[PDB]
A and B are shown apart, each in its own frame.
Chain A
Amino acid sequence: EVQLVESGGGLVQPGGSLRLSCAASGFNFSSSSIHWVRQAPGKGLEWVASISSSSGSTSYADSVKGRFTISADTSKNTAYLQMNSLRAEDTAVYYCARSEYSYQYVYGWWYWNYSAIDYWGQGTLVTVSSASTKGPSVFPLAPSSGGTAALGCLVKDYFPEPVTVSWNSGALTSGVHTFPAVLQSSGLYSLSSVVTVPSSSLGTQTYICNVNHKPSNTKVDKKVEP
């Protein structure tokens, strides 16, 4: 029944400030610790902060102290991770999750430890590019001179993700190996769409890749022939 809606991520230039909120319900926020944990793509997991709500005591990591400001509003049951002067490595996914404490009091006073990260939010992405949205350029991959032929059309120099590519307007689906996109040094993504077909089908059948990069409202079709 627990719901954690996190919103507000996106793109921003280096040095920009930004904040991610995380609405909650179901579980009493006034008695539960909220968090933020991020994940740069193709990498492990990174803890951001820890705000105990009513108590107020806060604890950031040892890598981004400062530029990240953490606050909460028990009345509205929301949270607020305010980020100042964003840098490039802010480009990642941001996850908001509650937790609980297991008091372990000993011969003396009482003590408290985080116990179980038993929920997570849907997920939000924050990126930092120092650039703007751009569509790609389509390039065919003419096969080299029974036998199975491998051909493709190359999509390059676009931003941001994603891009949708289909062969023959979706008519051809077998043998399609769409490699994961790679971020170019210039700041644009690039991906390749291929499909292997018999060498006999070359020429008689026309192969076209239907590429659509919605962020730039781009829709392009390119025919691949020897």
Chain B
Amino acid sequence: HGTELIPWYVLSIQADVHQFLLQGATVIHYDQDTHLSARCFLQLQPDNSTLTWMEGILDLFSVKAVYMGHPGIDIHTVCVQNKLSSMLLSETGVTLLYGLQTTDNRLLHFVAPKHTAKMLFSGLLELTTAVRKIRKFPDQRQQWLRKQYVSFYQYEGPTLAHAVELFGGRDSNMSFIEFVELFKSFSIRSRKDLKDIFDIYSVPCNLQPDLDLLTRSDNQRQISDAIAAASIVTNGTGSLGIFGVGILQLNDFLVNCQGEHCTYDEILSIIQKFEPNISMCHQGLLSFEGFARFLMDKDNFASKNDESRENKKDLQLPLSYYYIESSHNTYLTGHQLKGESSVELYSQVLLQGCRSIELDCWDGDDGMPIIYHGHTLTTKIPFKEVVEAIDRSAFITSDLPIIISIENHCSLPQQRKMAEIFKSVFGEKLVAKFLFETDFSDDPMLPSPDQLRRKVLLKNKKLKIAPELSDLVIYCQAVKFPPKCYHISSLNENAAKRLCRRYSQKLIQHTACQLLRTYPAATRIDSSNPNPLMFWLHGIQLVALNYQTDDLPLHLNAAMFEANGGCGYVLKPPVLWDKSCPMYQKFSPLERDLDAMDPATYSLTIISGQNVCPSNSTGSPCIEVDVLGMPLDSCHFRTKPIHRNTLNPMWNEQFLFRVHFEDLVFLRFAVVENNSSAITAQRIIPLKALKRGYRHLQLRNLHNEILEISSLFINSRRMEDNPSGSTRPASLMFNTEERKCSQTHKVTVHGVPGPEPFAVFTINEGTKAKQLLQQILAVDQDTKLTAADYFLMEEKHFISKEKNECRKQPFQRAVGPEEDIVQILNSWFPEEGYVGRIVLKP
């Protein structure tokens, strides 16, 4: 009944287990809604997409985690219900937590015989891992295609008439693969900008699995292209002499525009994959369709984070440096005074990566403390339930320590209940006492997060409240802000704001030896979150927020942590804490005068987007770029409103803006329908992770869900003006010298001896021609002595889109023996019909 909504090449399920899931098993479904259970035969439908029972249905993709021995289920009640001998709860019942939204937590659990339980658990665990990996993919167009086809199938396959409208064009059953190809013909033959970019370099001629990448038979190709031409209207690119790109034109493109430097074999490999027409591949070329595919590939999207992973080499510094994701009033779902409080939501915080949470403990109604917003209509919850629901899902994603903040409104005997509950549920996980030798020294410093992997910490008051609870707190003492390392304070929004305004340097230095959290203000009753950037600048680590509001600050917080895998410990800028920095303690972001610093220029070029009005065919898209950051660099922009186009708007406008602090800025690209002012897509991204040269940008909807089809084609260029005589660049002022040394460059040198026309060289910043030349010739000892008749010559050719204009001659210039290469490389601007190359000639 169609394809696999989870493709086979994604799973890792062994044949026996997958076959068992498909065949099914004998299980007892447990209902907690009405305290009922029944005997049912579970199954996994043909497509790895559902779990039917009989009568019912559940969609797997909505799953978020699976648990064994979930205390929510009463084992004894089940045993009595179906008269089965005592069954070990810890290993006889498994749980599903499926929800459509970021708040819904509706469970599904079964209790089955021993091995049946083992099979179902070990199966749905891998299915859940598959789903979690799928939702983290950079490119997901194929997934969208699968969903669309399957949905259209119900009970007939999509018709060409409908497939046309689906992609936005004006009764034969269509195969899925054919369907797929059709989409390709709307992702290449509907990008005029792509062709106009291609005709600047063309000359005349004639992690994620690879298979998933949509664009990575001949007769069908042509029919699909022809049908694409008829349907499209504008910017459409509808046998004689046709151009192409060689192993040298592409190398020019990469050395000059993008910035990538690829050696020969690498570039040949890169050309091998993309070319659709097999005929043109052998000659060593890349036909227009080939260029289109090369640009839209998953190795070309804007950010550096979409394919990131933990950098274990930076999490080894003390705990007082890294930022830390956090939440506020974890249990809450709605207002601060009228709403519910769902325990299961405590997982949404930890699963998404957060490493901090709050406990509003209150005296129990029967001796067991409960959690409720103080003196309101908010419902209550069992404290032990929450404590356990944290433990089970504490370390699914990350393996780095998490800190729980404790608020006490309980009685001392009932606080001892909490003490014992923690000592039981967590046991050794909870840090009990001092751990490391460095702690027992005259100058203690916080241990690094890695040394405490999968641990847990408690923030609360510490005695110099019952002694039992207090003795559990060693590293996070809550002493009201006036050894010092363990004293962590908490400040209300406004208090911290005024502290910053009245004091920059002192507060910042304070953040260099302790933690200091922050939470929204009391006046909020609908949870309008604060813009944390004012706080992040000075070094406030734990900026707690509310995880149920679809608003800008939340997306800012989310994007801030995509880096370093998502483990939520991103090193703070070295300027604040690295003593070796030349601006250490002398940088107050609340200031507005930086005469001793050189701002760097950025040229952003919003070329054109594609399909940036989801479910809105007719409209007037505009793009709002906005540089959130320090008070001195805030600036927004825009482009002209397009008319009745959403498949491929072409604004093609350039914003030039200078910025001062590279490390800590963010961009907020946002579609805006320019007739209702209702943002219909957006995408944030830090400015230290935007790849230069032409790139692609993947958008999102308001909820921060990923939209696949919508995308913006942009070009960024980072220009740094020469540090002429007196002042060092801001980039050099803010950081140390270690980064520049570690930031070595590639240089593509032509004419290197050998068969290959060009041979990359890796060179540091302080590299001149002489050593570079030695690198050209140091390979071989055959030469008796260094012959000076090998001089680099900064060659530069001339061509622009108007091929048929002049075809001027190539400029040339001797290379100064004492000239820095890095400046030469940074001095090439492919804007005037320019492509630099550095060639060795005698």
Contacts and interface: CB of A to CB of B under 8 A. Distances in A.
Contacts of B803: 103, 105, 110
Interface in A116-155: none
Contacts of B248: 54
B797 to A, nearest CB: 8
A28 B237 contact: no
Contact of A111 (B241, B284, B285, B750): B241
Nearest to A73: B757
A56 interface: yes
A206 interface: no
A112 B248 CA distance: 20
A57 B283 contact: yes
A107 B803 CA distance: 15
A109 B244 contact: no
A75 B195 CA distance: 30
Interface in B219-247: 237-238, 240-244, 246
Contacts, number: 56
B809 interface: yes
Contacts of B203: 52, 54-55
A112 B241 CA distance: 5
A56 B205 CA distance: 7
B199 interface: yes
A108 interface: yes
Nearest to A32: B807
Contact of A108 (B202, B238, B750, B751): B238
Interface string A51-63: 0101111000000
The interface centre, meaning the residue of B237, B238, B241, B807 with most chain A CB atoms within 10 A of its CB, is: B241
A55 B250 CA distance: 11
Given A28-B809, A31-B807, A56-B283, A109 B199 contact: yes
A52 B810 contact: no
Interface of A is mostly: loop
A56 B246 contact: yes
B653 to A, nearest CB: 26
B204 interface: yes
A28 B812 CA distance: 13
A55 B237 CA distance: 23
A56 B284 contact: yes
- Chain B, interface size category, equals 20 to 34
B206 interface: yes
Contact of B205 (A57, A102, A109): A57
Contacts of A204: none
Nearest to B804: A103
Contacts of A112: 204, 241, 243
A205 interface: no
Interface centre among B195, B244, B284, B804 (most CB of A within 10 A): B804
A101 B241 CA distance: 11
Given A109-B195, A111-B242, A52 B807 contact: no
Nearest to A31: B807
Interface in A82-115: 101-103, 105, 107-113
Contacts of B205: 52, 55-57
Contact of B246 (A55, A107, A111): A55
A110 B199 contact: yes
B288 interface: yes
Contact of A109 (B243, B284, B285): B243
A37 B284 CA distance: 26
A111 B199 CA distance: 11
Interface string B749-781: 011000001000000000000000000000000
Contacts of A55: 203-205, 244, 246, 285
A99 to B, nearest CB: 12
Interface in B278-317: 283-285, 288
Contacts of B199: 109-110
A113 B241 contact: yes
Given A108-B238, A109-B243, A28 B283 contact: no
Contacts of A102: 804
Nearest to A100: B807
Nearest to B810: A28
A55 B244 CA distance: 8
Contacts of B238: 107-108
Contacts of B195: 109
Given A54-B248, A57-B205, A105-B804, A110 B237 contact: no
Contacts of A52: 203-205
A78 B205 CA distance: 20
A105 B206 CA distance: 16
Interface in A154-192: none
A31 B203 CA distance: 9
Contacts of A103: 803-804
B251 to A, nearest CB: 11
B804 A111 contact: no
A109 B289 CA distance: 12
Given A56-B284, A57-B283, A105-B803, A110 B243 contact: yes
A105 to B, nearest CB: 7
Interface in B775-826: 803-804, 807, 809-810
B759 to A, nearest CB: 13
A28 B803 CA distance: 17
Interface string A21-49: 00000001001000000000000000000
B194 to A, nearest CB: 12
A55 B204 CA distance: 6
Contacts of A75: 750-751, 757
A112 B243 CA distance: 8
Contacts of A54: 203, 246, 248-249
Tell me which of A28, A55, A57, A75 has the highest count of chain B C-beta atoms within 10 A of its own C-beta.
A55
A31 to B, nearest CB: 7
B244 A111 contact: no
B243 A57 contact: no
A57 to B, nearest CB: 4
Contacts of A105: 803-804
Max chain A Cβ within 10 angstroms of own Cβ: one of B240, B284, B757, B809: B240
Contacts of B237: 108-109
Nearest to A108: B238
Nearest to A102: B804
A154 to B, nearest CB: 56
Interface string B199-216: 100111110000000000
A54 to B, nearest CB: 6
Contacts of A110: 199, 202, 243, 803
Contacts of B804: 102-103, 105
Interface string B433-458: 00000000000000000000000000
Nearest to A113: B241
Nearest to B803: A103
B835 to A, nearest CB: 12
A81 to B, nearest CB: 18
Q: Considering residues A101, A108, A110, which has the most beta carbons from chain B within 10 angstroms of its beta carbon?
A: A110
Contact of B242 (A28, A101, A109): A109
B486 to A, nearest CB: 68
Contacts of A113: 241
Contacts of B807: 31
Contacts of A28: 809-810
Interface string B232-272: 00000110111110101100000000000000000000000
A108 B199 CA distance: 11
Contacts of A108: 237-238
A57 B244 contact: yes
5 contacts: A31-B807, A55-B204, A57-B285, A108-B238, A110-B199
State the 7 A-B residue pairs at the shortest beta-carbon distance, nearest first.
A57-B205, A112-B204, A112-B241, A111-B241, A103-B804, A55-B205, A55-B203
Given A109-B237, A109-B242, A109-B288, 17 more contacts: A52-B203, A52-B205, A54-B249, A55-B246, A55-B285, A56-B246, A57-B205, A57-B206, A57-B285, A75-B750, A102-B804, A108-B238, A109-B199, A110-B199, A110-B202, A110-B803, A112-B204
